[PDB]
Design a protein that fits this description.
Chain C: This is 26S proteasome complex subunit SEM1. The structure is cut from a larger assembly and holds chains A (108 residues), B (405 residues), C (89 residues) and D (101 residues). With 108 residues, chain A is mainly α. Chain A contains six helices and no strands. The radius of gyration of chain C is 24 Å and the shape is elongated. The chains are: A mainly alpha (108), B mainly alpha (405), C mainly alpha (89), D mainly alpha (101).
Chain lengths: 108, 405, 89, 101
Amino acid sequence: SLDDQIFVCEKSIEFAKREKRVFLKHSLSIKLATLHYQKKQYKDSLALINDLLREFKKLDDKPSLVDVHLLESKVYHKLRNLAKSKASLTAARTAANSIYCPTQTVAE
Amino acid sequence: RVPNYEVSEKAFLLTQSKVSIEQRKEAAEFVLAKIKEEEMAPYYKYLCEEYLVNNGQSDLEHDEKSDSLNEWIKFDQELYNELCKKNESKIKELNEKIQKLEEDDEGELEQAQAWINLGEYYAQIGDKDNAEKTLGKSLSKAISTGAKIDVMLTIARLGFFYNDQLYVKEKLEAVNSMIEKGGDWERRNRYKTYYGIHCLAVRNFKEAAKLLVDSLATFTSIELTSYESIATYASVTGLFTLERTDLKSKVIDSPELLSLISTTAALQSISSLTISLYASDYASYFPYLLETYANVLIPCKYLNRHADFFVREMRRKVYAQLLESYKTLSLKSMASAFGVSVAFLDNDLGKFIPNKQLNCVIDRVNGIVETNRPDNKNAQYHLLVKQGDGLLTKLQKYGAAVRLT
Amino acid sequence: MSTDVAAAQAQSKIDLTKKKNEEINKKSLEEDDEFEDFPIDTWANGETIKSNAVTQTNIWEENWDDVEVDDDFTNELKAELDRYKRENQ
Amino acid sequence: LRPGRIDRKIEFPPPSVAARAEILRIHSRKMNLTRGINLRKVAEKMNGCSGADVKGVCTEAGMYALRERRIHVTQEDFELAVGKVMNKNQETAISVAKLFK
């Protein structure tokens, strides 16, 4: 069930800032956005991707924050605009000027 | 500032009896609450006055008739007591502010800023009159160039509120003189959105579609109206003016309109209608059209005026596509296809054919709809001679007149 | 609006002192101005401004949809009567 | 040749950060003004040896905005634009910054 998987991310993420590091807390954010993309609510998915895009633009070098840009492309795709999907493909490309970013990312 | 577009739309529904009382009685409850909160009592006087007869009878400023079915447009005497009290609290603060900052250094800029605030407070309570004066003093003395354009657009904003076409027009004229002096892209975007609405109220939709479709792509909501109203208002005026090829480019394959998806009932209504026109479906077009009118045109103040024209033209446009593509139809097949009958179709066609829109006849005897749209030289020659005949007359008047003196 | 382009005939012919005797002279045989006569006679001409949205003064360009009766009530009717007919076809 | 032999010897300095920012100042009006006033970003990140390098940012910035189909220049359009112009210089500066003696 979509519901329960979503619930386990909610417990973890609160715990991720008063027992654990920030690094974990922004990872679980993608996870939430990934399953809302499965549930077929786009308002939720986009809204999480915006929070990551802005705050960790300063802290962008992470293989984890390439995935943010990819997911963003996958959401603008399903909204049927391929101007901003392309644009956010192009953003992903800059943040993986590297071909030494994790292989799974590259395949995506 | 902000609550003006909200109040106006909500206030309009009440007047209209083509919309269901369920929507109206909701609308009033939201807006009555805003009316005490923001002190919109001067605008509230304007509303019951302007109709007059058919709503705005149940008040304490009118003698009560059965004509009005809102009593949520009915004043309190409490309302006036706060009105005055608030008016004094705020206005008094701002005066002290002018008298303080005549002493302190650089009064050209500071005094002007308190006169900018006087307009804000007047915009808040919905009295455009005393606002006109205070923003005029702000323009006159030294402020930033782009801020002069913001000051004008605020004046014009109040003109949409009351809904005088002649006042908004003049305010927008000073903006478009000042538009390239400031060079501002920021108040140029703002200009398309404001000037969008004015063109929407004009019967001219060609300039309304050019501004309102462009303003989708980079849209400003800093001291502006919602994107929800503009995406709908933009689709309507694009549907009329654009032809099938450009319809596809600028409405349907618009990435911005796509991304907004179906989240307002209005948006859903006009979206349906363009697609079904495009993909050549006729069965479903007839009930879509009805829904678009009910939920979109009417609630809107500015398309109330163009409501009737929309229905006529829309039928005319779907007929045009069909009539072009066929030499002959049956009265049977055409009627069934749109989803009406033989008796109904005969009336729909008796409107537009004697006006010479569709250029077609219906054989009643045979049972067919024959097509006789001229595309030949004869059609073309007629267009040409109409241009030269307006010339020959205009030469005759200018020529003669000079000959005498 | 008067024949052709009204704005061209406005621009063409203006007041002069030469033209003043002539304008009057013309007007008097026709008799009176028949724009200030009328409202005395009829007790006001009631031009709609509460019944149209392009008034009787003409704000911009007029709808010709005020010659017809609102045809939305008619199409709404037309549709329903077909659904029942359609059903039982 | 010799100083003052044709009178007036005036060396033109390479521009300071404050000067780079002013050279940038004027091109911004000509372009669409940035959202978020990120003018200082460019100026801090690098300082050139020419008024040409500054100018090079303006043009570079409009390649990226054009593609995104957004007119207005932004911080993101800027970050890509300063990275492109600084690329030319970082590469010749890593070879004396690394693998040296």
